[PDB]
Paper text:
In the presence of benzylphosphonate, a compound that mimics the phenylphosphate moiety of the substrate phosphotyrosine, VvWzb and VvWzbC9A crystallized in space groups P1 and P212121, respectively. We were able to model one benzylphosphonate molecule (with occupancy of 1 and B-factor of 82.8, 142.8, 109.6, or 89.9 Å2) for each of the four protein chains in the wild-type (WT) structure. In VvWzb-benzylphosphonate complex, the substrate-mimicking benzylphosphonate is located at the bottom of the active site crevice. Its phosphonate group forms an extensive hydrogen-bonding network with the P-loop, including the main chain amide groups of the residues Val10, Gly11, Asn12, Ile13, Cys14, and Arg15, as well as the sulfhydryl group of Cys9 and the side-chain guanidine group of Arg15. The benzyl group of benzylphosphonate is flanked by residues Val10 of the P-loop and Tyr121 of the D-loop and further stabilized by Leu44 of the W-loop and Ile13 of the P-loop via hydrophobic interactions. Compared with the free structure, the W-loop undergoes a dramatic conformational rearrangement from an open to a closed conformation. Consequently, Glu40 is no longer oriented toward the active site cavity but turns outside. Instead, side chains of Ser42 and Leu44 turn to face the active site, forming the W-loop wall. In addition, side chains of Asp119 and Tyr121 of the D-loop also made small local conformational changes to interact with the ligand. All these conformational changes significantly reconfigure the active site crevice, which is narrower and deeper in shape as well as more positively charged compared with that of free VvWzb.
Protein tyrosine phosphorylation regulates the production of capsular polysaccharide, an essential virulence factor of the deadly pathogen [name]. The process requires the protein tyrosine kinase Wzc and its cognate phosphatase [name], both of which are largely uncharacterized. VvWzb belongs to the low-molecular-weight protein tyrosine phosphatase (LMWPTP) family. Interestingly, it contains an extra four-residue insertion in the W-loop, distinct from all known LMWPTPs.
Residue numbers in the entry: 1 to 146
Write the structure that this text describes.
């Protein structure tokens, strides 16, 4: 039984808050949160989701308001049943932080051909559109399996 899901990216301002809120809307009886591998080093802790990420999600009827970026820690990992990373490369960075969490760590895009979800940060709204499309397709697949 996977009830608590942690969506992980690097800053926790773009992809991972979007994935959190998209999955949360699809799985209302589950607890979905998100965290960033380098949120602390990037000085992003407490920051809201990127304005374009909020805007694009809003246009797809998903609320990414009231988000606060947080750092991924071993303690945080122990609280969640399933961990979903945005890129395959994030796994090595995750294991460095929480080696014990590798067993429950999977790819957000696992069921859509194990696709990595590209970072739209610092780019135009079109890049955020692209990322949302992939996150949406990926989350819809996870929801069918959970
Ligand atoms: O939260 P994301 O989607 O990784 C965007 C981002 C945020 C900070 C540093 C790099 C990339």
């Amino acid at each position: 039984g996977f009830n608590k899901i942690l969506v992980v990216c690097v800053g926790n301002i773009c992809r991972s808050p979007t994935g959190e809120r998209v999955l949360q809307k699809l799985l209302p009886n589950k607890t979905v949160a998100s965290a960033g591998i380098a949120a602390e080093k990037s000085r992003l802790i407490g920051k809201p989701a990127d304005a374009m990420a909020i805007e694009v999600a809003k246009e797809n009827c998903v609320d990414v308001e009231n988000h606060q970026s947080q750092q991924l820690t071993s303690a945080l990992c122990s609280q969640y049943d399933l961990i979903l990373v945005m890129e395959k490369g994030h796994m090595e960075a995750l294991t460095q932080i929480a080696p014990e969490a590798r067993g429950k760590t999977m790819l957000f895009g696992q069921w859509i051909g194990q696709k990595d979800i590209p970072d739209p940060y610092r780019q135009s709204k079109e890049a955020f559109v692209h990322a949302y499309q992939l996150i949406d397709e990926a989350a819809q697949a996870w929801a069918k399996k959970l």
